[PDB]
Amino acid sequence: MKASRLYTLVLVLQPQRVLLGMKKRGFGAGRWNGFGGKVQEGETIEDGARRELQEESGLTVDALHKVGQIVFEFVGEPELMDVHVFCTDSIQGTPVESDEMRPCWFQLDQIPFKDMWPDDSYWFPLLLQKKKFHGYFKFQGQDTILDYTLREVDTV
Ligand SMILES: Nc1[nH]c(=O)nc2c1ncn2[C@H]1C[C@H](O)[C@@H](COP(=O)(O)O)O1
Ligand SMILES: [Mn+2]
Ligand SMILES: [Mn+2]
Ligand SMILES: [Mn+2]
């Protein structure tokens, strides 16, 4: 039994492209990823996801839809990362570089998997297919998966 900390992950997914952010600092720096961060006290998970999207990309959206949940375990870290994954296709501003993230659009036949977290190669395809998923990944460091589980679900 480990304890877990709540995080969000937000993918702006349109019919032919996806918005990713190049992490400029901190955890996972140098990788393209969705936008997000720790959920704060007093906010719902969805509202934390909306806040992090605004802070890191400049985009303000009224609503997100939950598409997945992924638990990350790191060797040597007793605390699990409980990551709630959200999507939307509906935006109405331009992405803006923040201190944390540089946003960039990618065509959906140019998803930059080699420069994303290794786990994304497994669950991102389900997201593209509009399937919901539960995942778990145990990492040695930032590059090596020692164990993982991925399942399509009907309810996240
Ligand atoms: N293995 C992984 N794969 C992934 O796609 N995103 C991850 C991840 N591990 C952490 N993240 C995301 C979850 C959060 O959005 C962010 C971590 O929080 P901050 O470093 O505070 O932004 O990175
Ligand atoms: Mn953040
Ligand atoms: Mn934060
Ligand atoms: Mn963040």
Side-chain angles (χ1 to χ4, degrees), residues 29-43:
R31 277 162 177 176
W32 297 101
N33 203 2
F35 303 94
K38 292 169 189 174
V39 176
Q40 295 171 7
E41 179 169 12
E43 71 187 356

Side-chain angles (χ1 to χ4, degrees), residues 36 52 56 100:
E52 288 285 349
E56 301 193 337
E100 178 115 316

Side-chain angles (χ1 to χ4, degrees), residues 7-9 23 27 33 36-37 72 81 100 117 119-120 123:
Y7 297 78
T8 57
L9 192 57
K23 188 64 161 286
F27 190 79
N33 203 2
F72 295 111
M81 303 181 46
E100 178 115 316
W117 276 92
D119 49 285
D120 292 25
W123 58 262

